[PDB]
Structures are given as C-alpha cells and as structure tokens.
Design a protein around this motif. Structure first.
Motif, PDB file in Angstrom:
ATOM      1  N   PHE A 152       0.888  -1.183   0.000  1.00 60.07           N
ATOM      2  CA  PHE A 152       0.000   0.000   0.000  1.00 60.07           C
ATOM      3  C   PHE A 152       0.916   1.221   0.000  1.00 60.07           C
ATOM      4  O   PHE A 152       1.591   1.473   0.994  1.00 60.07           O
ATOM      5  CB  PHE A 152      -0.877  -0.012   1.265  1.00 60.07           C
ATOM      6  CG  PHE A 152      -1.665  -1.271   1.436  1.00 60.07           C
ATOM      7  CD1 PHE A 152      -1.100  -2.384   2.084  1.00 60.07           C
ATOM      8  CD2 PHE A 152      -2.975  -1.364   0.994  1.00 60.07           C
ATOM      9  CE1 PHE A 152      -1.810  -3.543   2.224  1.00 60.07           C
ATOM     10  CE2 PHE A 152      -3.697  -2.530   1.149  1.00 60.07           C
ATOM     11  CZ  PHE A 152      -3.128  -3.620   1.773  1.00 60.07           C
ATOM     12  N   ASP A 153       0.931   1.947  -1.107  1.00 62.14           N
ATOM     13  CA  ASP A 153       1.653   3.201  -1.238  1.00 62.14           C
ATOM     14  C   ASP A 153       0.843   4.242  -2.004  1.00 62.14           C
ATOM     15  O   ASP A 153       1.221   4.720  -3.080  1.00 62.14           O
ATOM     16  CB  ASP A 153       3.042   2.983  -1.886  1.00 62.14           C
ATOM     17  CG  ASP A 153       3.966   4.196  -1.694  1.00 62.14           C
ATOM     18  OD1 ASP A 153       3.736   5.006  -0.743  1.00 62.14           O
ATOM     19  OD2 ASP A 153       4.942   4.295  -2.475  1.00 62.14           O
ATOM     20  N   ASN A 198       0.446   7.351  -1.275  1.00 66.27           N
ATOM     21  CA  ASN A 198       1.105   8.679  -1.371  1.00 66.27           C
ATOM     22  C   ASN A 198       2.458   8.642  -2.129  1.00 66.27           C
ATOM     23  O   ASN A 198       3.219   9.628  -2.120  1.00 66.27           O
ATOM     24  CB  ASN A 198       1.260   9.325   0.002  1.00 66.27           C
ATOM     25  CG  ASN A 198       2.138   8.555   0.923  1.00 66.27           C
ATOM     26  OD1 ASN A 198       2.556   7.438   0.622  1.00 66.27           O
ATOM     27  ND2 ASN A 198       2.410   9.131   2.076  1.00 66.27           N
ATOM     28  N   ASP A 242       5.422   7.572  -1.872  1.00 67.88           N
ATOM     29  CA  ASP A 242       6.693   7.995  -1.233  1.00 67.88           C
ATOM     30  C   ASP A 242       7.685   6.841  -1.097  1.00 67.88           C
ATOM     31  O   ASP A 242       8.747   7.026  -0.574  1.00 67.88           O
ATOM     32  CB  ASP A 242       6.429   8.713   0.100  1.00 67.88           C
ATOM     33  CG  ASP A 242       5.827   7.829   1.194  1.00 67.88           C
ATOM     34  OD1 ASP A 242       5.540   6.624   1.005  1.00 67.88           O
ATOM     35  OD2 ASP A 242       5.712   8.315   2.335  1.00 67.88           O
ATOM     36  N   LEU A 297       7.296   4.257   0.798  1.00 67.65           N
ATOM     37  CA  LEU A 297       7.245   3.766   2.120  1.00 67.65           C
ATOM     38  C   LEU A 297       5.884   3.226   2.461  1.00 67.65           C
ATOM     39  O   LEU A 297       4.857   3.767   2.011  1.00 67.65           O
ATOM     40  CB  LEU A 297       7.562   4.933   3.092  1.00 67.65           C
ATOM     41  CG  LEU A 297       8.864   5.719   2.784  1.00 67.65           C
ATOM     42  CD1 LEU A 297       8.921   6.957   3.641  1.00 67.65           C
ATOM     43  CD2 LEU A 297      10.049   4.813   3.047  1.00 67.65           C
ATOM     44  N   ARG A 298       5.853   2.205   3.310  1.00 65.95           N
ATOM     45  CA  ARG A 298       4.651   1.603   3.818  1.00 65.95           C
ATOM     46  C   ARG A 298       3.597   2.651   4.302  1.00 65.95           C
ATOM     47  O   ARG A 298       3.902   3.516   5.120  1.00 65.95           O
ATOM     48  CB  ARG A 298       5.023   0.690   4.987  1.00 65.95           C
ATOM     49  CG  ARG A 298       3.870   0.091   5.745  1.00 65.95           C
ATOM     50  CD  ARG A 298       4.229  -0.482   7.107  1.00 65.95           C
ATOM     51  NE  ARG A 298       4.851   0.521   7.968  1.00 65.95           N
ATOM     52  CZ  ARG A 298       4.208   1.269   8.894  1.00 65.95           C
ATOM     53  NH1 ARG A 298       2.901   1.133   9.122  1.00 65.95           N
ATOM     54  NH2 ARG A 298       4.895   2.163   9.597  1.00 65.95           N
ATOM     55  N   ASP A 299       2.400   2.565   3.770  1.00 67.69           N
ATOM     56  CA  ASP A 299       1.272   3.402   4.288  1.00 67.69           C
ATOM     57  C   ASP A 299       0.791   2.903   5.635  1.00 67.69           C
ATOM     58  O   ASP A 299       0.691   1.679   5.890  1.00 67.69           O
ATOM     59  CB  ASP A 299       0.091   3.307   3.343  1.00 67.69           C
ATOM     60  CG  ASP A 299       0.321   4.049   2.037  1.00 67.69           C
ATOM     61  OD1 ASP A 299       1.369   4.726   1.795  1.00 67.69           O
ATOM     62  OD2 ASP A 299      -0.616   3.956   1.217  1.00 67.69           O
TER      63      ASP A 299
HETATM   64 CA   LIG Z   1       3.471   5.526   1.432  1.00 69.15          CA
END
Ligand SMILES: [Ca+2]
Ligand SMILES: *[C@@H]1O[C@H](CO)[C@@H](O[C@@H]2O[C@H](CO)[C@@H](O[C@@H]3O[C@H](CO[C@H]4O[C@H](CO)[C@@H](O)[C@H](O[C@H]5O[C@H](CO)[C@@H](O)[C@H](O)[C@@H]5O[C@H]5O[C@H](CO)[C@@H](O)[C@H](O)[C@@H]5O)[C@@H]4O)[C@@H](O)[C@H](O[C@H]4O[C@H](CO)[C@@H](O)[C@H](O)[C@@H]4O[C@H]4O[C@H](CO)[C@@H](O)[C@H](O)[C@@H]4O)[C@@H]3O)[C@H](O)[C@H]2NC(C)=O)[C@H](O)[C@H]1NC(C)=O
Ligand SMILES: O=C(c1cnc(N[C@@H]2Cc3ccc(Cl)cc3C2)nc1)N1CCC12COC2
Ligand SMILES: [Ca+2]
Ligand SMILES: [Cl-]
Ligand SMILES: [K+]
Ligand code: NA
Ligand SMILES: [Zn+2]
Length: 804
Positions: free
Chosen positions: A681-682, A684, A686, A688-690
């Motif tokens: 799940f990303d 946004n 970025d 990195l893990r949401d």
């Molecule tokens: Ca993210």
C-alpha cells in the motif's frame, strides 16, 4: 554587485568562499562572474605549458610559469606533474608494477588517508573494455584496485541528478534535483543548465559529502569547477592543496571532467572521434598519479574513478512528436528529450485533463517509442514520484529515441548523435566505478551496484557518520579492506500471535461458500502441519520481522506459512517453497468459487465474500497459489479466507499467469525456489509503507483495503546444483513489485495470450528486496547462515533482464 577591484594575491583557489561584494578567487568564481580582476593573471597561469623538459630542470624559479621545474618545487608543492620523471630519472606511475597497498603509507602529519574523487561525465561502462588500449593509467587503476563491471546511475540518467546523488546518497526525488531542467510550483521558479537560478541553495536538498565532512571536522576541497579552468590546472590545484599544512589541508577532493560526455553528444558513444577524449582523460589520470607519486602520496590516498551516466546513440530522426497524437498541443508544457514530463501551460485552464492526455498517448502507433504514465504508476525501482517538481504525467522514452512537442522544436533549437537520460536499467546508461588505495581491496572485482550506495562508502573512507540516505550501509563492505561498517539487524517491533482453533464455522457470516463437506493417521498429520511441522521447508530464511507496531498472526499450513494482519485483513507476507520436481494442478471445478473461513481467525478480522460480490470492479486472488498445492487435501488450505486478497480482474490475468506458469518455470530453471509474496500500500507514492489512515480505496462497503501493488521475492541457491531448500552457500534472488491496476493499458499487446506480454511487464517492474522492505516495513533474510553484509548486498541486488 561584485567590487572586482580586490585582489587574488595569496588567495588563488581559496577553499572558503567569501561574501559579496568582496571579489572571489575560488574554483567557481568564474561561473558567477565574480572573480577579482587579477584572477586570470595570478591563478590561471599558462606560461610554458604543463610539462617539464630537460632544459627546464633545476631552473631559476619564474613565478609566471604554469608549473615549476626548479629544485624548490617539491617543497613548494607546485612542480609540473612530470618533474621527477624528466629531471630526476623516475618512472611514470603507470610504468611501475602494481604492488599491494596493505596499509596507508602517508607523510608525517596525515591523520587519515585523503580521498580524491575523479568524476567523469558520460563515461559509459563499456569504455573500460572497449577503450582499454588507449587508457593505460585507468586500466592500471582498474586492474590493481577494486572495480565493478558497471555502476547503475539513478533515473533520470542526466548529469545533475546523478552528481547530486553521488554527493548525498539520495534518490533525486529526495534531494530535489529531479532533472537537468525543473519547475518548482511552490517557489514558482525554474531551474536550468544555463543561467543563475540553479545557484540558489533552495534547489539542493539533503546533505552532500562536503557538508557532512565540514560538520564533523574534516576539511573539504570545493567539488565544483568552472568550465574554463583547464583540467591540468584542476589537477595542479588539488596537488597544491595536498601540500598545505596539516591544519589547513583538506581530506576530501573532487576532480570533474566534462569529457567524454561533451564529445559523446556530438559523435555518439563510439564515434571514431571518441578515441581522443578517452586518451586525454587517461593522460589527466596519469598527471594526478605522477603528481601523487612525487609527493609520496601514491600509496596514501584513496582514489575513486566514477562516472555519472553512460551515453546512447540518438539522432534527430528518432524523435516522436506529441503533435502527432494530441490536438490540444499548445495547452501543454513538455520537458522534452530522453524523458518527457507534461504539465498544463496555464493553471487557469479548467479544461486541461490529464486523463484525456494519457489516453491520447496510449498505444496509438504500432511501434510507439514512448509510454505514458501517471508518475505513481512508474516502476517503483525508479523511485521517481515523491517530489512536487516531478510532473504528474511522465513519458518513458525508448532507448535511442527522443520525444518533443512539435517538429519546429527539433530543427529550430541534424547536429547530435548521442544522448542519455533513459531508464537507469538500460545497458548504454551504465557507468563506471574503480576504487584504488589502502582502504580498497587489491585486484578485486565486485558485482555491479547502484550509485546511491557510494555516499556511505565515501563516509566510511573518511571516518564520517553519513547523513540519513537511501544507501544500505554495509552493502558495499566487500569493496573495503578496512573501515567496514558493521550494522546490526533492526529490532522486531511487533511479535506475532500464534492462534489455534478458536471459532466454529457457524460464527462466520461472510457470504462465502465452499463445497468442502468431504481417519486418525491423517488427523494427527494435519494438526502437526497446522502447528508448523513443514515450516522449515517453506520458511527458509526465518520469518520476516515486522518493524512497526501492529497486530498479526502467524498461520501455518502444509504448503505455506503466512503473517496475517488483523488490521489490513490479509497477509503481510506469504512464504512457500516449490521444488524442481513440483507438479502444477488445476483448481477443481467443485472449488472454483470456494472461500473457507479460517477457524483460527475471528470473523471480525476476516474478509467477506459479499463485499466482493457487491463490488462490481473488484475481484479476488490468492497469495499462495492453489495451482501448486502438494496434494488434493492440502489444496483446501489455499482457499482459506486468510489467503485471499483483492484483485482487479485485469490484474488477475497477470497474477494467474505468474502463479500457474512462471513459478514452476523458475523452480525448473533454478532448482527449486522459495517465494515470499504479499500486498503493498503506497497511496502517497513515497516508497514507504502506508499507515491505515493513508489508504484511499477499499472493497466496496467493507474495511478491506486495496493494495496499490503486489510483490514477490524469489530466492534460490546461487549454486544451482543445490536445491533451494538445501543450499550451503550464497543465495540468488529476483523480485518484483507489480502495480495493481484495473486495466492493462500499460501493456500494448495485452489482448494477446499472457505468454506474449506478462513476463515483459514483470521485468519492467523488477525490484530490489530493499525496495519491498521500505514499502512493507518488513525485514527479510533474518535467519541464514550468511554474513549480514552479504545479505545486505543480496537485498540491494536488482535483476535487470538486460543482456551482458
Ligand atoms: Ca506511502
Ligand atoms: C530516502 O532517504 C531519505 C532520507 O532518509 C528519506 O527521506 C526522509 O523521509 C522522512 C519520512 O518521509 C522525512 O521525514 C519528515 O521530515 C520532516 C522534516 O523535514 C525537513 O528537515 C529534514 C532534516 O534536515 C530535511 O532533510 C527535509 O528536506 C526535505 O524538504 C526540503 C524542502 O523543505 C527539500 O529541499 C529536500 O530536498 C527534502 O525534500 C524531500 O523530502 C520531503 C519530506 O520531508 C518531501 O516532501 C519532498 O518531496 C522531498 O522528497 C526537510 O527540510 C518532518 O516534518 C516530518 O514529520 C511529520 O510526519 C510525522 C510522521 O511520524 C508526524 O508524526 C509529524 O507530526 C510530522 O507531521 C506533521 O506535518 C505533516 C506534513 O506537513 C502534516 O501532514 C501532519 O498533519 C503533521 O502536523 C517527517 O519526519 C525526511 O525529511 C526525509 N528526508 C529527506 C532528505 O528527504 C526517504 O524516505 C528515503 N526514501 C526511501 C524510498 O526509502
Ligand atoms: O559545472 C559543472 C560541473 C559539474 N560537476 C562538477 N564537479 C563534480 C560535482 C560532484 C558531485 C559529487 C561527486 Cl562524488 C563529485 C563531484 C565533482 N564541477 C562542475 N557542470 C555539469 C554540467 C555543468 C554546468 O556547467 C557545465
Ligand atoms: Ca553527465
Ligand atoms: Cl530533465
Ligand atoms: K466483484
Ligand atoms: Na493493453
Ligand atoms: Zn550529456
């Protein structure tokens, strides 16, 4: 305003930059039109050229000369680099035998071996072999020192993004230099190669090596050189700084050459005109090494020879024009060339629609030499989205091609035959790395690695603590004789629950059905499987560690083990091993729509079938593939609601081919494989893990979050004569991060059988294990018999699918 009436007397190539309106004498003053009036006379002497001759030996010192051949030059530090050769019967460094440098052999008063970075613009990896006959100094560095076959640049494979990545250890999206041209909508300001705005400090994020050094009490030479300062003078300036007193002398220096890039653009990467630029660069390396030898520094300094990117054959005739696809071409702004970035010409135009632009650019011509993407849909391995300077619409351009807005742009700007900027996995964009010195290994070849890793190593070479960056510190320890960095595995934050049978079937009202209403030998046998009796076969490298706070359960089964999240209602990871001998089977007719409650996991922490029925866009798949069950009885485990994940029907075509065909193919080719698969799940973008509160899409009417991507990590024995599950030595890995998209618009041939397009998609979305770690907050390979640094190298490996 520059009051250029000050003087550079005693100040030539001063290290500390002085503040306006005081005039400057540093290596960048020319670039700002800010040098003192006497800079050229005093600091850019050229008289008599760059080489001693027999007739100058022991001369009377004439301070007009570019360099010196007088008896005092060595103690002054300003001899021509060939002085001892011409005047004292010494050999050139290149003519000396290689001799291992076991320890630094430095003059008294050196606290640490200096580092000199010799950076070359556009130096394609294959030049090391192809130009070896004309580069004897570079070939000696390469063969005597530590070298990689190539080094991978960052995307875009342009100069400033890569030089700044070298400096910081950061992806372009994080350091902010996302191209050679940029618009920042927050500043409302543009950055260009020409002109002044690029000197403003607000463009340049992170902490470059020179600042890291200075903040920790290590002095640095200035890394940037004005274009007009000739290379010979850059070298003599470095050698002069190395002769400074102990309390004034830098420990880190950089040389930069605009070659061979400058010529490569004009003549192509292998134009016959390329031989001379390569010769000249080699000569410059020779001047540096002869210079170091004269100062007794040739077995003291660590030298890095590194490029920013390679160079490809690209001509004007290989240009795609957006005017051939878009009717509205005057309503957009394109950043053109070897990549494309599109935004609206006017933020006041309410009619501008990125969806309509993307669709007008998608699969329109049969051999179309670019592909459009919303930036969040670009391969995750590019790490090219999380910056407001990256336009939402991106064009990935095929190697050898350009994209432009209109034909008038290309003939009102054929000239050029080379360019770069393409996807950083492309062979022609690869560049070089050689390390030579007491801290590097002797006569050692290392595997290819990414340029984001070098900042940490440069910090290691100087005894600095690196700023937070995107390297994986320790993954390049195998380059080094000493000064290795010895990291510890991160601590697990959440420990798992190990649930037993706690729920009766009738407690579940999930809307699921399965035709499964169908002996003490095999009743004990299946209980043991549920308590983890096959876990050693399917979990080969330990369970992954969860590095954030959450609630999850380990679930054991005959054919697979999973870490099941009570928060996301699905596995974080599913692990299974497929031997070479494994058989593929079908999903039986009676089980086609089968989903079974998992009596270890509460109805409240389970998915439900009715949500999938109601959601007309969303279907589901399985993480452990039913196709690869070990037996008809074991197959029932694959239909547990705890092995289900949400999948668009278009994606299921991809996933099903991977599971039914490709896993077995890999197990056949690699002598068994271990697969770990899971959701990402990303939302946004970025990398990195949401967290839960970042999820933008759920299965209609439910709390079931929809992944943006699905990963798999496929590990086997590097020695493929050993089976994956009984491997004594180093591991081999390939991984992917597939976008979870509701169409296959990315794949222009997707109407054809999956054997003609799925694998190509998967290769495009190849990934490092480390990329998956960032995206999931999981830490893999916790329990191996290998050294942690070796596992760090493994985690940074990228399988590129390019030929040799
Ligand atoms: Ca993210
Ligand atoms: C690659 O390596 C890098 C480096 O490790 C990783 O990047 C880091 O990721 C961190 C997590 O995203 C991030 O941490 C945030 O930092 C905020 C403070 O940031 C400033 O200070 C640092 C330190 O000196 C500085 O480096 C930053 O520089 C960025 O921004 C300037 C512009 O100002 C740029 O010049 C520079 O290039 C850089 O830009 C990049 O990063 C920013 C994000 O910081 C992006 O927006 C850019 O596009 C570009 O990528 C900064 O100057 C800090 O304020 C954050 O804290 C918030 O979030 C926490 C979550 O725990 C929350 O609890 C806090 O309350 C706080 O939230 C509040 O603010 C929110 C936002 O306004 C708001 O919505 C909330 O409601 C709250 O009120 C956060 O800790 C770190 O800055 C960057 N560092 C860098 C150099 O990029 C990167 O992740 C790695 N990549 C991969 C894939 O692994
Ligand atoms: O102006 C320069 C230039 C570039 N780079 C440099 N120096 C390099 C910076 C850097 C960063 C990291 C490391 Cl490890 C080494 C180095 C050396 N100097 C000048 N270029 C590039 C295009 C133009 C603009 O005008 C021509
Ligand atoms: Ca370059
Ligand atoms: Cl660009
Ligand atoms: K559905
Ligand atoms: Na398609
Ligand atoms: Zn170039």
């Amino acid at each position: 305003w520059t009051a250029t009436s000050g003087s550079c007397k005693g100040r030539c190539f001063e290290l500390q930059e002085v503040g306006p309106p005081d005039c400057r004498c540093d290596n960048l003053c020319k670039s700002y039109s800010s040098c003192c009036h006497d800079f050229d006379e005093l600091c850019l002497k050229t008289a008599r050229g760059w080489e001693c001759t027999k007739d100058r030996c022991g001369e009377v010192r004439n301070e007009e000369n570019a360099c010196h051949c007088s008896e005092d030059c060595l103690s002054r530090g300003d001899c021509c680099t060939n002085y001892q050769v011409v005047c004292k019967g010494e050999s050139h460094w290149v003519d000396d035998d290689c001799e291992e440098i076991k320890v630094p052999e430095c003059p008294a008063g050196f606290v640490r071996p200096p580092l000199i970075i010799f950076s070359v613009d556009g130096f394609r990896a294959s030049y090391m072999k192809k130009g070896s006959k004309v580069m004897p100094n570079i070939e000696k560095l390469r063969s005597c020192g530590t070298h990689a076959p190539y080094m991978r640049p960052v995307y875009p494979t342009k100069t400033f993004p890569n030089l700044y990545t070298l400096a910081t250890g950061l992806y372009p999206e994080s350091h902010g230099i996302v191209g050679n041209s940029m618009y920042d909508p927050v500043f409302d300001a543009s950055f260009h190669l020409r002109g002044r705005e690029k000197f403003n400090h607000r463009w340049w994020g992170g902490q470059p090596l020179w600042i890291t050094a200075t903040k920790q009490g290590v002095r640095a030479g200035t890394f940037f050189w004005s274009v007009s300062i000739p290379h010979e003078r850059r070298i003599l300036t470095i050698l002069q700084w190395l002769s400074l007193p102990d309390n004034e002398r830098p420990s880190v220096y950089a040389f930069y050459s605009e070659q061979p890039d400058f010529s490569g653009h004009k003549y192509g990467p292998f134009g016959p005109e390329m031989t001379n630029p390569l010769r000249e660069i080699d000569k410059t390396v020779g001047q540096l090494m002869d210079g170091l030898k004269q100062l007794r520094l040739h077995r003291c300094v660590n030298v890095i020879f590194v490029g920013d990117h390679g160079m490809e054959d690209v001509t004007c005739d290989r240009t795609e024009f957006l005017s051939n696809y878009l009717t509205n071409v005057d309503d957009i702004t394109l950043v053109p060339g070897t990549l494309g970035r599109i935004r609206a010409k006017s933020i006041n135009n309410s009619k501008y629609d990125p969806k309509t632009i993307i669709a007008a650019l998608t699969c329109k011509k049969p051999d179309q030499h670019f592909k459009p993407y919303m930036k969040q849909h670009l391969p995750k391995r590019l790490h090219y989205a999380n910056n407001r300077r990256i336009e939402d619409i991106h064009l990935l351009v095929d190697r050898r091609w350009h994209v432009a807005r209109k034909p008038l742009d290309v003939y009102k700007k054929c000239f050029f035959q080379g360019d770069h900027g393409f996807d950083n996995k492309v062979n022609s964009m690869q560049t070089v790395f050689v390390g030579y010195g007491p801290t590097f290994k002797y006569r050692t070849k290392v595997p290819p690695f990414e340029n984001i890793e070098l900042y940490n190593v440069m910090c290691d070479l100087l005894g600095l603590k690196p700023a937070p960056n995107n390297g994986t510190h320790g993954s390049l320890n195998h380059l080094l004789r000493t000064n290795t960095f010895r990291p510890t595995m991160p601590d697990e934050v959440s420990r798992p629950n190990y649930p037993g049978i706690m729920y009766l079937q009738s407690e579940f009202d999930l809307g699921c059905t399965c035709d499964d209403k169908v002996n003490k030998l095999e009743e004990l046998n299946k209980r043991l499987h549920t308590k983890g009796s096959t876990k050693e076969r399917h979990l080969l490298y330990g369970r992954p560690a969860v590095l954030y706070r959450t609630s999850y359960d380990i679930l054991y089964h005959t054919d697979f083990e999973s870490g099941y999240s009570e928060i996301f209602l699905m596995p974080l990871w599913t692990s299974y091993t497929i031997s070479k001998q494994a058989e593929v089977s079908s999903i039986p007719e009676h089980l086609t729509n089968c989903v079974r409650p998992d009596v270890r996991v509460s109805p409240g922490f389970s998915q439900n079938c009715l949500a999938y029925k109601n959601d007309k866009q969303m279907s589901y798949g399985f993480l452990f593939p039913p196709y690869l069950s070990s037996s008809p009885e074991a197959k029932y485990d694959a239909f547990l609601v705890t092995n289900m994940v949400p999948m668009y029907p278009a994606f299921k075509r991809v996933w099903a081919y991977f599971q039914r065909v490709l896993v077995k193919k890999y197990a056949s080719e690699r002598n068994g494989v271990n697969v770990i698969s899971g959701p990402i799940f990303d939302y946004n973008y970025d990398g990195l893990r949401d967290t839960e509160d970042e999820i933008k899409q759920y299965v209609e009417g439910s709390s079931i979050p929809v992944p943006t991507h699905y990963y798999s990590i496929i590990t086997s024995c590097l020695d493929f004569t050993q089976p994956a599950d009984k491997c004594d030595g180093p591991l081999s890995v390939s991984s992917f991060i597939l976008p979870h998209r509701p169409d296959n618009d990315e794949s222009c041939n997707s109407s054809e059988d999956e054997s003609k397009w799925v694998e190509e998609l998967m290769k495009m979305h190849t990934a490092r294990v480390r990329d998956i770690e960032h995206l999931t907050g999981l830490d893999f390979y916790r329990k191996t018999s290998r050294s942690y640094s070796e596992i760090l190298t493994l985690k940074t490996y990228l399988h590129t699918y390019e030929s040799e």
